[PDB]
Ligand binder design. Structure first.
Ligand code: CA
Ligand code: CA
Ligand code: CA
Ligand code: CA
Ligand code: CA
Ligand code: CA
Ligand code: CA
Ligand code: CL
Ligand code: CL
Ligand code: CL
Ligand code: CL
Ligand code: CL
Ligand code: CL
Ligand code: CL
Ligand code: ZN
Ligand code: ZN
Ligand code: ZN
Ligand code: ZN
Ligand code: ZN
Ligand code: ZN
Ligand code: ZN
Ligand code: ZN
Ligand code: ZN
Ligand code: ZN
Ligand code: ZN
Ligand code: ZN
Lengths: 253, 254, 253, 253, 253, 253
């Protein structure tokens, strides 16, 4: 438990006299993840990663970041909304939320935000361009935690898009109590009938009811806690460096 | 302890996919300073914990199975609160968009009954519910503040107890003692309006936190105890369990 | 007829050289009231109450208030929209209206507004919160006219929620020509089949099509003009006092 | 007082057993009208015309029309918003209002609506077009009451755009108690400095602050009740004829 | 080809060192025009007229105007949206477009815009009113090109509302290669069955599915390039004159 | 000029009796492109490529596609909005436009759409997600034309992000009349001061006012028409294939 950098457990007494340089907003989804992983995986993983990166930036450079509570409202695909307790969030709803967050942070004096997404269906570039014009003095960056470091050499499964080896391993590391690997299905996935879409000539969202069986995309069976521990270490290190640099530099000098 | 059957925050598809759910409970909170000593997420944490307890009671007692959704941390706040660090004011339209998206999804999934259990008195859902009643005429949405299910009067000593006070502190001490250090609390001294009729409640204006409060609390929380909190939530939990069961077993009118 | 404090009958020549301290916005509904009361009851009653309070405030303290034209756009319940000429107004529509009113009044130099509602279906706290941030120097209060003084002990009917003894008495007092009590039905109402909702553990809107027969909720038969006269006197006095204090004090001092 | 065709005075008891063929929606503004005319002129005038026309159609044809309460929310020009108690309504606010009105009337089974406007600043064609796709079985027509019959030859003043001889004469006829013509300014107006805008090659809204003194456009001096009575007789007959034809014919046959 | 005044062919190099006085936005529609005219007629015609007008203003007075690319998003009528490739634009969508265009132009330092519409179903008065409050130092004017000079006098056909003799003649002048007059139908149109709507007591949009056979409204078959040339000459001169006056005068002086 | 597959030149008479299988929506931007390339480069290029692919699909397989007029409304970066005649479009405005296009196309019976973007600032995945739930029977795919084929071996310049060698070459091929290579600047660009943003640990938009001098990103000076001609051949062939597969297969089979 870290009240200095994790708002989810913090209180005003602990934060009111401290200077904060960068705000971190974990952004996930309420989404089924194969049969074995939590509905809130895309919130929990970026939150725990962000807190660790915040701890490193503080101990390493004295840069203090606050990790906000994660946003559980993700954008989903055809076939997912019909699965129980999967919440599809319209883009405009997500934008309204980010607007309200940035408005408040701005009033509070903050000027640097990183959105750390745990859901690949979330896209923030358009929202960020629009807010760049409303709040010209407020820097907003965006990343998916799972794109900071390539999974090559860290995991065996070749297909690993959702609730696969990487997500399961990272969950096993941070919260082994939240996942029983023995409960996982194989995460078999089916391609489109339009070859050009499989060749990525153009993009169409995967339909979950046609493309998946257990809601996972990728076999998680070789996942371990140790694999998760090893993978997140360079992720945390690179994110901490970004927080430090966002704190220490203007965007252009 | 961890309950994947009724607490979506810890649950997974494997546990939920072969079970029948009757009622959905949406805890709706705020990200909001609570004096110096309570968590920023107090208004999310408390209704989540109450609702899970009531879900567990309804299940063991009647076989009525409810799902408690993840708490919504987007509250509507007052003047002077937005400037406090990490407090997030949410516009009513933003909240309505959220509830629209939740209801749309739950409706596609086959669900037809939802209770919004609020932890924050600044949240108001009657307009959203009226508007959604016309869009989804087969979908029942109720709303309650957890702290209005049973009056705190009798259960606590402090007479002023509106925000981060004795009652909220006690219930946090009960459910999450590790999250609250009572020794860190301020007195929660509050200042009334200079317009008497507003103090008398002839009309309503929002309290300005910057003018009205010193430590962001409204009410002295210092006689708070875990046991006071435990005793107060017992009847709240039992009444909510009863509402869950009757929502599951009856239509609104018969 | 009072052109000084009632915009419904006023003109620019009467008002242009006067100072106004508080603006009053009566907000009602276009809504069936049992068989006997006007569709515009919820506009008419706060308008007349407001004008009398404004007159009292001026005579007694020299505080001059303008009563704006009533908003006939109320928020209604399931079953009411199907009744002829009942106009359900969405919350967003209502918010748009109040934004336009506040924006104009602000440009005109006004900084003090009371919304005096005649329809309990209307809720303004959310709107007021959001406008507080948009216009921080603009004070907006809201009240239902019928909550200023409790009707318990002014009226005999136990149930009296809509077009019952209280509303009818007050209409009989202000506009006896618009109400014929002989035409009223009993206003019988049915409760919910979910006991916890009648006990008010939680809130669900009453469904008019299941809960009412004639659109009324409460028996109006014991209504008299004299009861209405007696009931509005302290409401008007209390509101006049509010206006005076709003004109004469800052929100905090 | 006519509870049959005027909702502003009507009740559910008088309306509930009767068939209504056309709904008429008076749509005005809250707007200063020189020094002499009511703020609510643009609501009062279409309301009274429409009621008289509805009474004519009913007595001569048995076609029954309901005249809804006037919408006091108009679209205004630069300079008007700063005049006390003028309320500028955004187009989107107006459209939200009509959508709510039409959605309610539609559920009630009504299929034919006339928006009878009293304010030239109001434009409903875009709203009507959009609602024709949402409710293809719902006929919406719009008219300005003051364009049903040209004022040429009914009034003396050449410039007569706002709070001028025609509107004043029509108010003198319907509500002589609400207007004292001796209080009027000359309603002097200044043109643009861009000649082609005065020639109407292109449209720009008139700025009230630059172009008017007393808020009127056109001298009302020669207004009389006689002139008002004479002008409205053919307007009322034309509108009664339209109500009858909307009632008895499909748009196309 | 004119890179000085036509953005559709221009590049930053050509424009970056020149002073621009007025911005011209052609606004059209994607709409069937009888059998023979282009879908983009309403974009092409005002574009070509604006460019010629800008060229005349430049040569004659040294006033330099930029003609923006045409907006192909018009507001359409019942029965048109079912015709292949006709795109109906909601009023709110058009307003969002104009807001974005104005916000960008304002930031660039421009303060004068003319919207030149090619489609009668487009209405900008409301948008202009709302924007005058948001951008008080930004003059926006609007005109339909075909209303700058009345076509009566210049053309034979009695009816000429859409894709008729005037539009066909003007297209044959500017782009003879895009129109084969031999393919045109007669553009026969049916009136309403409600007499008063044909007489224009009130407005209802024409229903294209009931009212037209070939999608045209007006017989175009006497159209000629010479007639089109003749008609655009005085339109081009009047518009050039408006651009020069807009550039050289404040709205009021 | 091909009226069969290019709506910008087509007319109802040519299309009304033909079966169309897939709709192609070119989506561009109004944006400075170094000194030498047109402001409409991002509209013109995907338009011309789409028309060629539509011709190939028809000649080769009998699959008939309509290329809609290009949408000139792009999402832009800080620094771009201040450049003359650059029009930044908010995400919500873009989505309102796509909502309108799809609504119309759906009414007309079409069930398949490819958005072919010319501007990398445009992002359609969110809009497409939200529309999949609104119109579950309507397939929407998105592609950037410049991502269909890698530039490796086709062009020399290493940096080529905007108005560089590839775009300049492709414009020289399709419209040599619209580009003078001799006018081009070097398209020099500058990185961020935040090293982790240059390493792509997270995303922030480039600020044009700090990162470019001439508005281009990439040296265009080795561009040729023959390089453009060679490059678009496989782009056209792959897109033709996608159009055919879209016409002939369900998304999943
Ligand atoms: Ca399946
Ligand atoms: Ca680093
Ligand atoms: Ca009970
Ligand atoms: Ca008092
Ligand atoms: Ca001239
Ligand atoms: Ca620079
Ligand atoms: Ca292929
Ligand atoms: Cl689904
Ligand atoms: Cl996908
Ligand atoms: Cl409050
Ligand atoms: Cl209720
Ligand atoms: Cl005007
Ligand atoms: Cl029309
Ligand atoms: Cl970028
Ligand atoms: Zn995930
Ligand atoms: Zn995910
Ligand atoms: Zn609280
Ligand atoms: Zn709270
Ligand atoms: Zn009432
Ligand atoms: Zn009411
Ligand atoms: Zn008027
Ligand atoms: Zn007016
Ligand atoms: Zn046309
Ligand atoms: Zn047109
Ligand atoms: Zn480009
Ligand atoms: Zn581009």
């Amino acid at each position: 438990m870290n009240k200095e950098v994790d708002l989810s457990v913090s209180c005003l007494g602990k934060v009111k006299e401290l200077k904060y340089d960068v705000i971190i907003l974990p952004w996930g989804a309420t989404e089924p993840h194969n049969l074995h992983l939590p509905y809130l995986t895309d919130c929990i993983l970026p939150h725990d990663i962000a807190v660790e990166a915040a701890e490193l930036a503080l101990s390493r450079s004295g840069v203090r970041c606050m990790v906000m509570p994660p946003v559980p409202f993700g954008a989903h695909n055809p076939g997912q909304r019909e699965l129980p307790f999967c919440i599809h969030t319209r883009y405009a709803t997500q934008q309204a939320i980010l607007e309200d967050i940035v408005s408040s942070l701005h009033v509070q004096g903050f000027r640097k935000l990183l959105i750390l997404s745990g859901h690949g269906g979330n896209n923030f570039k358009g929202m960020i361009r629009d807010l760049a014009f409303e709040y010209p003095d407020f820097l907003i960056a965006a990343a998916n935690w799972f794109e900071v470091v390539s999974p090559k050499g860290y995991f065996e499964a070749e297909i690993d898009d959702h609730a696969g080896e990487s997500e399961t391993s990272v969950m096993m590391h941070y919260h082994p109590e939240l996942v029983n690997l023995a409960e996982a299905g194989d995460g078999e996935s089916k391609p489109f009938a339009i070859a050009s879409l499989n060749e990525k000539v153009a993009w169409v969202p995967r339909h979950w009811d046609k493309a998946t069986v257990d809601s996972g995309v990728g076999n998680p069976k070789k996942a371990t806690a140790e694999k998760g521990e090893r993978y997140v270490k360079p992720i945390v290190e690179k994110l901490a460096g970004l927080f430090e640099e966002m704190a220490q530099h203007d965007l252009y000098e």
